[PDB]
Amino acid sequence: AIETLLHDPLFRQRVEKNKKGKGSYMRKGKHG
Amino acid sequence: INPVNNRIQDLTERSDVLRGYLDYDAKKERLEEVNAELEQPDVWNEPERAQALGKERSSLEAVVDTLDQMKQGLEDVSGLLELAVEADDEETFNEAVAELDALEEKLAQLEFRRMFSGEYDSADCYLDIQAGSGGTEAQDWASMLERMYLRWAESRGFKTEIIEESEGEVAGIKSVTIKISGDYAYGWLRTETGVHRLVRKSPFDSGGRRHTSFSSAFVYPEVDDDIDIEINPADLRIDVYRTSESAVRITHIPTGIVTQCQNDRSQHKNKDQAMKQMKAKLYELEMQKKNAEKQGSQIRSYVLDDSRIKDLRTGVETRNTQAVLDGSLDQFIEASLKAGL
Amino acid sequence: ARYLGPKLKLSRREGTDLFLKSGVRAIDTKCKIEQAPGQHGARKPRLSDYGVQLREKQKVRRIYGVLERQFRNYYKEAARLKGNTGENLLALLEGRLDNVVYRMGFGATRAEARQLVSHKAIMVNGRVVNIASYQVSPNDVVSIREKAKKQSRVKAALELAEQREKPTWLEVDAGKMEGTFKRKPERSDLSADINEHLIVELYSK
RNA sequence: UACCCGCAGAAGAAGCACCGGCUAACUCCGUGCCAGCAGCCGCGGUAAUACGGAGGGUGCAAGCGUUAAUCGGAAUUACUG
Ligand SMILES: [Mg+2]
Ligand SMILES: [Mg+2]
Ligand SMILES: [Mg+2]
Ligand SMILES: [Mg+2]
Ligand SMILES: [Mg+2]
Ligand SMILES: [Mg+2]
Ligand SMILES: [Mg+2]
Ligand SMILES: [Mg+2]
Ligand SMILES: [Mg+2]
Ligand SMILES: [Mg+2]
């Protein structure tokens, strides 16, 4: 059961959200 | 003489290290009790038990005895050296220089023995690299991993061969089976089973976003013609498909795990190969089960942006990422072996 | 049931002098009275609407040495009573026996006064009263009892008081060590810096 | 028994929650989309006032937090409205 192990959401391709580029815009910063 | 001098201390140090690794005190204790038991005449009345006891004792003695010898041999060598120094004679000096080598060799041998505890470490094995879910990136990562492993094999002096390869449409590989061949291959590679986390900025992506991909490697030794268990003809399914007619996939129903082969030219050859692979896999699974009875899957994280590779379980970091990629992974593997996971 | 910790820290936090020490030695000499406590003292964050009110409340509570539940109760009582609420609350606070004693000058500090009260020193109409939270009514004579009359601390306290500004609403004798609570004080008799209104507001949210 | 008088000596007697915003209280260290947090918005992918520890602070206090449950805020069934 290796293929199933690879399948699990645990190992789904994450992509880091942008800070300056396309998804840059944050309505409210981490602090005020 | 300087090299000789260096060698005396170094050997001692390594012996010390070995002893520490062993945790010899416990062993000694075991031997003691066992010895006592042996000495008692009532143990030999029941034969099998007695035999078992005997078996237990000797190994314990021998490991411990070997250690003792090393301790003592080293001391003797040192004494000899001292004598040589005191009495300006060439022959004595020469003797001092020489005798140490043998001890060192012995120590090395012992260490090797310690390392490769499992029964099938000596035999050749089947590396199996399956790419992640992600997409193209995952495939690419898988391909890279494969490349790394092959280079490592080459460095070692291992004969590699691609049993199966499935390619990714854009780039990289979907999955790949590799047969490595040589002395004690599985003993090295069995540690490197598991998931490998690549973390880098994706060139296949249009934007410069930072992607996190995975790929499993899975290693199993070749156990053909030695092992008694065989696959049930009803549970075994054969299947044929096109090369990229020739290739053959095998499927096992109870466990629900498959193995394939496309390297051979005719069908018969392929099928046999598949069968061989499958049985090996089964054996591996059985042994794993046994281990479990006796008694997350991610093993390494290659972070190419920040330029650090860190084996998770062992806890060894390196910044020469490129080097590692090129097949300089020996370091990780040896650490893993030492750990004994 | 009491704040036992550092007294000047509280004062620092407040901003002002809370009179939590005897007044022999000026508060600036004992502590950095301007700079708030802790590692982040020099920084002065802009304080919120809620926050200022809270601070004010604390100040008053700190001054008198009253914990929160009691304070709340007092506030409630004030509200119940006829007339201006904040003023009423203030009056109630004043009325406390320990506070009265302090005013008279038998305790250097309010804490001292409280201690004295606890330790059966203060007779109120000839009957020993031990409760610091006891409300001293109009025309209630309140005195040191003969046993505690000899204590050097009491005389020191008196001396200190004599340096301090005297309250109009009491009448105390240094020789006899007995004072008459003549009338509950008007708001004008108390300190102007206390914004009772803020406190009132706070207890209505 | 309450209450009172005498005896000794600071002696026998302080914790819990929180500190991104709402919400009073901020910094350093470790980890690095993990481990974990979370009431909502959210935080964490190697300079985290949001995780864990420390120092510092804030709020309550012989209690302090969590959970449950009711009204409130909800003019969000509005008779008032
Ligand atoms: Mg109480
Ligand atoms: Mg009123
Ligand atoms: Mg704030
Ligand atoms: Mg928390
Ligand atoms: Mg760090
Ligand atoms: Mg940090
Ligand atoms: Mg960050
Ligand atoms: Mg923190
Ligand atoms: Mg509700
Ligand atoms: Mg309603």
Side-chain angles (χ1 to χ4, degrees), chain B residues 63-74:
Chain B
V63 168
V64 171
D65 198 313
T66 294
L67 264 49
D68 285 13
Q69 281 171 43
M70 280 312 318
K71 189 72 172 182
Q72 191 176 4
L74 269 162

Side-chain angles (χ1 to χ4, degrees), chain C residues 77-86 88:
Chain C
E77 176 52 39
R80 195 197 57 70
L81 291 153
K82 299 195 181 73
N84 175 317
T85 301
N88 281 7

Side-chain angles (χ1 to χ4, degrees), chain A residues 2-23:
Chain A
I2 285 63
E3 341 70 312
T4 332
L5 165 151
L6 215 296
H7 265 115
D8 192 44
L10 213 176
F11 309 117
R12 270 162 192 184
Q13 184 186 214
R14 310 135 167 75
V15 187
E16 209 197 53
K17 194 229 185 84
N18 265 286
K19 298 205 289 182
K20 205 208 170 184
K22 259 193 191 194

Side-chain angles (χ1 to χ4, degrees), chain B residues 104-112 114-115:
Chain B
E104 199 260 81
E105 278 181 5
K106 167 64 167 178
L107 211 155
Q109 193 236 308
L110 199 286
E111 111 170 19
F112 184 91
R114 157 81 281 97
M115 277 190 202

Side-chain angles (χ1 to χ4, degrees), chain B residues 219-234:
Chain B
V219 193
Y220 42 109
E222 302 185 34
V223 309
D224 193 30
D225 308 325
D226 187 44
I227 269 53
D228 66 325
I229 70 98
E230 192 169 24
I231 309 192
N232 190 30

